[PDB]
């Protein structure tokens, strides 16, 4: 009676970096809801592109120590704060972001000079605290990859400190199945529950996961253009002893073993 | 250089060259002394006036059981300085995270407290202030206040940084080890990763335990390690 | 479910020294039995030795079962089932690997 | 002052330090076992039976560890004390099999 339709039943935004969304898909035949929920969860967790800082270059700072003057936070803690920055972007490849700031004050995500296609989800995120009137320039490395992907190149070693950034824009995902019976009408209802870090709304993550899943199974529909006698043994057939020993050394006992390896043939072909 | 102003007070009573396990009849003014609180004892070191409480006067020192008035004389085991010095005070101990019994409602599930067994007083290089742009810790002169023995000594520090006494102090890295007994100075570029430090200690311990476990086998003498 | 603990034939790890201890017990039992036939020991002395030498061996194998599991195969499926207290005890495992 | 001070082996004691394959007991420090009772200074029940006894435990039990340890020995990944892996080495293999 009904058609397969989806709807958002719950939608909460109790943060600038924590969005919640619950979605319903119905009616579904028996066994389909589990398949959709499993695949969608995999797409949401790793197949969705995420943008975050991967490397940090401390320009004009030859200290190379764990701490620098004028900044309360240690160098390692600054990288930790950078790793928490939530970014949304459509960039292809890699870009460069710069943080050149004044003396005393608070360095926040609002102070990051951004490449054209990227945005700061929450500009209030704290990077570092400045005490002494000293300028600080930071060379960021903005990259956009999937959660499941892995990268090995790390700019070798040129005083650029790598940031082990996790590329998940969907913090968590879960699916639930509700089955309703009417005597013989077994329909299933699929609930999709998505948590995002604000880089994309849960409704958007639902569409991207669906599109990424479809793009995976499109190639299976691709087409390409067109252009215009174990029971007989070598013992029985009369063979020279020289040839017989050579075959026996190579575990060629039957004739099938002989044809599987490639005046021997002249005598053999007649029988 | 950079000697601190050698001022003199009126209540100054020098305790140098006194018996250790004996108490003093009089009572000292705690405002004039640094109060070092440890697990087994409370340690007092004369505090000359200063904008920041960094100047220590080791001429008179007192040790008392924690939160008690009966002062005593610490067991000095090293030639403590006779001049005012600036020492960075950093404690050394363990966290005693315990699960107390629960009888009253809403009693805490855990009780986390820090127990101090030793306190390190690292002299500032040339007695320079913390706010000084040229501040750096002189790791040669470190004093250890042990709670268990209620004694204060000087750290036996091994300097492995190439450069001798003329080296650059900014590259020093004091490595305290063996229950605050082995002090070693190494170059900062040679710092061990904290993961390496933990794994190294675990590998040594388990290797000895594995050998003892395998020692009872009767073919141990004709077996290899790998 | 995710870890999927499961026991196999070789998961039933036996003490490495069981072969030595059993062989040593057999030698003592055989030597004593031979002299019992000679008349150097009487029946009760043979009876006690047979019971005690095999009970001491069995208890020693049970005693050394846990330290062997801990020191060599801590994640042995049979060990984790009993050591964690989930199912079975040392005595029941001893019936399997001792 | 007086509290400030300004500033490897080879073969054994270096393989042992680094964990590289080495004998458990240093061959240069292995004392030769002294002569013992010669079955005439000893009571009965401690003498060798003068004729080896069939035990049913005379063969070492086949193990996964022995096969892999022998396979690793010829590859050079491991260096065993002898041709055949001892029960100590097989037990050690289980601890470090992964």
């Amino acid at each position: 009676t009904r058609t397969l339709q989806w709807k958002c039943v719950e939608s909460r935004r109790d943060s600038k970096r924590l969005y919640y969304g619950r979605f319903i898909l119905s009616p579904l035949m028996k066994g389909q809801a589990d398949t959709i929920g499993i695949a969608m969860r995999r797409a949401l967790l790793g197949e969705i592109e995420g943008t975050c800082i991967t490397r940090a270059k401390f320009e004009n700072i030859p200290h190379d120590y764990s701490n620098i003057v004028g900044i309360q936070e240690s160098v390692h803690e600054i990288l930790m704060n950078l790793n928490e920055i939530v970014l949304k972007s459509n960039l292809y490849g890699t870009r460069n972001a710069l943080i050149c700031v004044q003396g005393p004050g608070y360095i926040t995500a609002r102070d990051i000079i951004l490449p054209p296609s990227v945005e700061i989800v929450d500009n209030t995120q704290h990077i570092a605290t400045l005490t002494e009137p000293i300028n600080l320039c930071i060379g960021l490395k903005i990259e956009r990859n999937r959660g499941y992907s892995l990268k090995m190149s790390n700019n070798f070693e040129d005083r650029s400190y790598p940031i082990d950034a996790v590329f998940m824009p969907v913090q968590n995902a879960n699916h639930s199945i509700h089955s309703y019976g009417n005597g013989n009408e077994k329909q299933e209802i699929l609930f999709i529950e998505i948590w995002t870090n604000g880089s994309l709304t849960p409704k958007e993550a639902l569409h991207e996961a669906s599109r990424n899943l479809i793009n995976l199974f499109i190639p299976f529909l691709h087409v390409e253009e067109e252009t215009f006698f174990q029971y007989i043994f070598i013992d029985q057939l009369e063979l020279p002893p020289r040839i017989y020993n050579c075959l026996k050394k190579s575990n060629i006992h039957t004739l099938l073993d002989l044809l599987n390896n490639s005046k021997l043939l002249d005598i053999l072909e007649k029988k | 250089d950079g000697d601190i102003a050698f001022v003199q007070s009126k209540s100054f009573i020098s305790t140098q060259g006194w018996d250790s396990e004996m108490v003093v009849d009089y009572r000292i003014n705690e405002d004039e002394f640094h109060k070092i609180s440890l697990l087994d004892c409370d340690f007092f070191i004369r505090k000359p006036p200063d904008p920041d409480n960094d100047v220590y006067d080791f001429r008179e020192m007192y040790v008392t059981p924690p939160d008690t008035d009966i002062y005593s004389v610490p067991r000095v085991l090293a030639p403590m300085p006779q001049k005012y010095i600036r020492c960075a005070m950093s404690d050394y101990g363990c966290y005693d995270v315990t699960e107390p019994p629960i009888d009253a409602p809403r009693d805490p599930l855990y009780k986390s407290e820090r127990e101090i067994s030793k306190v390190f007083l690292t002299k500032h290089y040339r007695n320079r202030r913390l706010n000084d742009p040229e501040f750096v810790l002189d790791f040669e002169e470190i004093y250890v206040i042990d709670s268990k023995t209620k004694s204060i000594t000087r750290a036996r520090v091994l300097v492995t940084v190439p450069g001798g006494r003329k080296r650059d102090r900014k590259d020093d890295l004091l490595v305290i080890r063996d229950n605050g007994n082995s002090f070693k100075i190494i170059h900062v570029g040679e710092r061990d990763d904290p993961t390496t430090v933990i794994e190294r200690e675990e590998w040594t311990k388990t290797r000895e335990d594995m050998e003892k476990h395998l020692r009872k086998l009767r073919d141990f003498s004709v077996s290899n390690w790998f | 479910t995710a870890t999927s603990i499961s026991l196999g034939i070789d998961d039933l790890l036996t003490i490495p020294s069981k072969g030595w201890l059993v062989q040593d017990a057999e030698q003592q039992s055989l030597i004593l039995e031979k002299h019992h036939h000679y008349g150097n020991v009487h029946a009760v002395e043979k009876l006690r030795q047979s019971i005690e030498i095999w009970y001491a061996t069995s208890e020693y194998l049970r005693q050394e079962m846990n330290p062997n599991f801990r020191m060599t195969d801590p994640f042995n499926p049979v060990h984790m089932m009993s050591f964690s207290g989930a199912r079975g005890n040392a005595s029941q495992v001893h019936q399997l690997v001792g | 002052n007086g509290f400030v001070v300004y500033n490897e082996e080879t073969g054994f004691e270096l393989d042992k330090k680094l964990g590289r394959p080495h004998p458990f007991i240093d061959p240069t420090k292995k004392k030769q076992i002294e002569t013992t009772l010669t079955s005439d200074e000893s009571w009965w029940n401690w003498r060798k039976p003068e004729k080896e006894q069939w035990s049913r435990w005379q063969r070492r039990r086949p193990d996964v560890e022995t096969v892999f340890l022998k396979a690793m020995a010829e590859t050079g990944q491991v260096k065993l004390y002898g041709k055949e892996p001892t029960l100590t080495e097989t037990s050690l293999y289980r601890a470090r099999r992964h």
Binding site: D164 | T196, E202, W203, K205 | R87 | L18, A95
Partner: peptide, 29 residues
């Protein structure tokens, strides 16, 4: 109880974790 035991059965330590004597990721949350 088995599942919880496996969860809390932490890292391999010492000689069970490294082949040789030494002589890891950081997560912000």
């Amino acid at each position: 109880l088995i599942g919880l035991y496996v969860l809390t059965s932490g890292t391999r330590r010492g000689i069970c974790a490294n082949r040789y004597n030494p002589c890891e990721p950081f997560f912000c949350n």
